[model samples]
Target: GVLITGCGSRGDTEPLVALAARLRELGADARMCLPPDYVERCAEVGVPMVPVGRAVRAGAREPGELPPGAAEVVTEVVAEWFDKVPAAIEGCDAVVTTGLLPAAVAVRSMAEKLGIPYRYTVLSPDHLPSEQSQAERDMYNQGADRLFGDAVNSHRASIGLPPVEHLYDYGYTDQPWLAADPVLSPLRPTDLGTVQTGAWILPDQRPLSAELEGFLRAGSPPVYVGFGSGPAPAEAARVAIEAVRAQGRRVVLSSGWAGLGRIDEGDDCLVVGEVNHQVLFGRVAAVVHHGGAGTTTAVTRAGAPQVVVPQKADQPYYAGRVADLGVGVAHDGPTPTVESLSAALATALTPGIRARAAAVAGTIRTDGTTVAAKLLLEAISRAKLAAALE
Candidate 1:
């Protein structure tokens, strides 16, 4: 039994969905303990659910944080999952969980109690802090672990497990897998056995809508600008629209959770709710978004230059990757203005950017799912063999 668990937003969830879909296609009994909001989405992809939380609520902020009682909100949201998600692990043999610090500690502890082998899947290498900063990385990696450790550790004790003895190097996963392209640092390998597969893609087979197709046909390959389920949809829409119009290029605003539909962007823009990224990205001139693993891969595979407007988490690192790869540029966020995004898009639409983007895309492993399936199946077999031998 394969138990797929995730926390946080879609940047973490979508890839897990794709992996579950592929696992099912290969005839595995894959189940998901996903966010409550994605229950319907999991069913659409044929993944059964043991839901984690009731709703995806705002993060609970600490006292003295700008918005008082913000931390309390997060505490409430996490408390529900901390108690419930571990129960979903009941019948599974092995667990696969998002490496987001909070989810990682909770699920990792649950798997420990069951004495089953579990691995962590990070959307990007930056999630783990990596090889060079290997020892001194604590300076960078301290935030998440520090903020949530007290709450997380308290639950671990309550569950009858001993509290974590040592917190050295943030105690990263024993079996960690980074589902990101390793094209850049192909020369350097991290000491941790993180199987860095190239942009581990799970194919999105959902069909594109007629409205989206018509929009594509109506323009000269418009640039795609969507923040995709962020906190500030209106701001995302305003900047994307202003940037596109100022650049005089056609645009496709993926209304995504950021209220682009509420504000009209003239006849030159198409405000879509949800069209399949796999189907739509390839048809575009260039792609721009919050630098999610899903969006990054879709645009990369489409061979289009990308402009990243990152909000937080691993997004800044992914955006930097685009700039580092010479494939595109990254704009400062929270709310990027028309001028900054326009300049970034200007860089994205260039011939040099297109050529490099295509070159990098060509090298990424498209056989990721097939390869991962074989590795997972064989690893499970090995685990069983070792257990029986003992």
Candidate 2:
């Protein structure tokens, strides 16, 4: 049996769920430890899951210390994991951690207690600390320890374990897995000994809705605008719809976590929910999105040009990659004005960018989860063999 644990919004947990599904396809008993919100979602995907923590809530946040309320939520999640994850991992030969810091820190300890082979994965390279400054690194760990140390240490003590000095680094392990597509978000050389697995794309088999299909047929491939699982820019729907209209392209807007609606009632715009990007992106004139790793990879694979308006964290990096690949334009900042987004959409709609996006799409790997799952099973097999020899 293999236990996969992750926490956060859909972007974080969904990939691990994909991995769990892949493991099951290979005839392994795979289960998930996830935030309460994603349990049913995973179950619908045919993956059994055990809830590990409070449902994670998303809000606007800057790139600094967590807000007081977010911190409180983090503490609760950590405490919950310490209470719940041990039972989830029992009888599992291995554990994989792939979400936020709190879930990883707690599960790594429990996996250690059970002497299971543990794998830690990061969906983006930026999730790791930068190599620029020891001060920057220490500052991050310092904050991590402060936020997570008590729950981690208290949990450790109850299980007869010693206190850990560095929570983040310890959870990351010596060789963490980087689950990013190589061309989209390549791993630069670093001291972390990171293992780069191409993006773990879920095999989404759902067809686009009849309404969305009719909308697509009615237009000359509209621009798709969505910020999957993150807060959209202030008045983003208004600004983006207006901008795409300026380009003379119709709009296919996804009401993601933000629940954005039409700027004003217009035939040029259609709002969708939870449609399949694998099919929709290929038919779009361009994809305007928040540059999430999942959305970016989906856009890349579907051969669609993009305009990436990065929100925060690893988003800017994904945006830079889209621009660097010449498949899209990277919007300047988080907040996109009509003019700024119009200019970006204009570039994304150009023939050169469209051709490049289509050409680059051929290079995206589709077997990433398969590769990771095979490696995971091999690692478990070898670990059991070694234990027997010992």
Candidate 3:
């Protein structure tokens, strides 16, 4: 049997479940190491699961104060979890982990101790390491070596071991590293992968059904507004409501996981619980959002212009990408107000933005989930063959 450990969020869990289901369809004994929170969901989905450490806490607030010089807090906390990694995969054949921040650090350690093949599954826009300036690239390379390097001279000086050179070569590589790899050819325009997840809400789905059709059929397309799972849902909703009112335009409010509580309805404003951005974007005049990767992909795939109000982390990065693509506008978190939002919306609704979005969307639509599923299955098969060879 093979064990797949280190899945935290639903985003990470879905791909694993998809992969597991595919493996089972092919008669492989595939199981996953999941956190306790997802136990029931996994069981309901009928995927075999093993309970692993709940060390990765989601939605936990940091305490008011800590001891001075607690800069090493994250590293120490991650190291504590590292002790459990090997035990979690005591008898597994292979492990596939996702994300970079803390999970990558832990998985790399576990793979080293267990002497099993490990592969990293990253889900985001690929940034080329070589595109960076020499100094910046050197810094990134140094950081990667320190975090995943196995050499005695590596950053993990506390644990003495012979230099494990595999970290620098085969463990992981950014898009730039991939470009530099001899075996992996540089990506071509024809090879641009599908960016949308299959978990999108459908147009026929409630809230969006009547609302989207009405918006598109009306005089002018309405602007869409909603933040994904950001922290300040109420604030975002208030701002959005005010922005739409100022613009004298109808607005479609998305009720994403952020729980932007109910807003007062109006002749020009509709508050919705959940709507598929994929199905709703093209029908709308313009879109505004918190800039989560999924939402960005959906809007881009719909070929609709957007305004991104980033909250934190990768939100800002994706927001920047949208702006660079010229199909959207990006605003700093603190600067998003009713006036500014309305202004951005006005610009985004222009025919030029719409045209660009539509062209990009067509390209994205050509890429689908089937190819991603195939790649994952191939990886699993390769892992099995490698184990057999050993």
Candidate 4:
């Protein structure tokens, strides 16, 4: 069994779930070690998970409202989870993690302790960086190395391995894996030790909601307005509805926990419960969303233009990549007024952006699942061979 450990909001965990599903289809036993609540979402995968305690409310905070000194708050939250990870990772033949969570640290140290292979799968391109550069990122990374080193050294000593002086040396295996498509993000290296195995996209096979069918037929394929997993759902829904109306377009609003829906009009909009992005994105004219990689992938695959109004973190990164790719516009926010969002919608409606989006989608290869499975099996084989030689 492979233990896949990761945490954040659902977007962080979603890709991991997709990877785990692919792994299982390749005849490996795959399990998740995640927050208790998210297990239900992963139930279809059918593998047992190492359940970390308690459920969490979806979209408890607005995306941009991260604490000014958020590191302190995050550090506090993950300390116990750090301890929880080592135990969860114990029985798996290998460990794979979504980078930047407490689980990554725990699984890194634990997998090494147990003499298992591991890799980190991340969606954001800027996650791993060059240590040779003396930028702000390097300084912070160096400091983090010290902190993680201090936390893991004793455990390393117990396992008879050298101390973890730098996090990269311990956290990543020889191959750094990115579960993102190269065409979608062209600024980075396509060759090297890095494994860019296109996105492991999950199939959205579900049919659309009833009113959704009616709404789609009612007007022109409207822009979809739904930000995933944000605290101000009702408020954002209000803005999205108004913005699309102002732009003289129809809209389909999702009530997917982050306030994509609060149930509104039949004339110009359809506000409804959790709709499958796979099916919904293709039918929409444009997608206006929070810039989670999954949503970004969905929009891209659907050949839809987007307006990414991101709050912070990887959201901004994906948004910039979208705009850079000429497929979307990125809106910066702790605050985006109705006018700004309306303008973004107008931008997405342009013929050039729409055509570019379709062109990019056409070039994308959809066989990421097979590629990821092949890499995981290869890694497992290498680990066994190394063990035999030792």
Return the number of clashes found in candidate 1: 7
Error of 2 at 167 (Å): 0.8
RMSD of 1: 5.0
Residue runs of model 2 more than 4 Å from their true location after superposition: 58-69, 129-132, 189-192, 383-390
- Give the residue spans of candidate 1 off by over 4 A: 57-79, 129-160, 166-171, 184-187, 190-192, 231-235, 262-265, 332-336, 383-390
Q: Which candidate do you rate higher for lDDT, 1 or 3?
A: 1
Which model, 3 or 4, shows the larger lDDT? Answer: 4
Model 2 per-residue lDDT tens digits across residues 16-79:
9888887777777789998666766787679989876555544334345353226767777777
TM-score of each model, paired residue for residue: 0.81, 0.91, 0.62, 0.81
Give candidate 4's total backbone clashes: 4
- What's the distance in Å from true for residue 36, model 1? 1.2
Q: RMSD of candidate 2 to the true fold?
A: 4.3
Residues 129-233 of candidate 4 have per-residue lDDT tens digits of 531244754565576665555555555565576866556544544456778877775435544667788887766556787789888877789888766755443
Model 2 residue 335 distance off true place after TM-score fit, in angstroms: 2.2
Candidate 2 residue-wise lDDT at 121: 87
Total backbone collisions, model 2: 0
**For residues 308-368, could you state the per-residue lDDT of candidate 1 as single tens digits?**
8887666777787777878888876656788888888887888888888888877667656
lDDT of each: 0.69, 0.83, 0.56, 0.70
**Residue pairs in candidate 3 whose N, alpha carbon or C atoms collide under 3 angstroms:** 129-176, 150-164, 151-163, 303-357
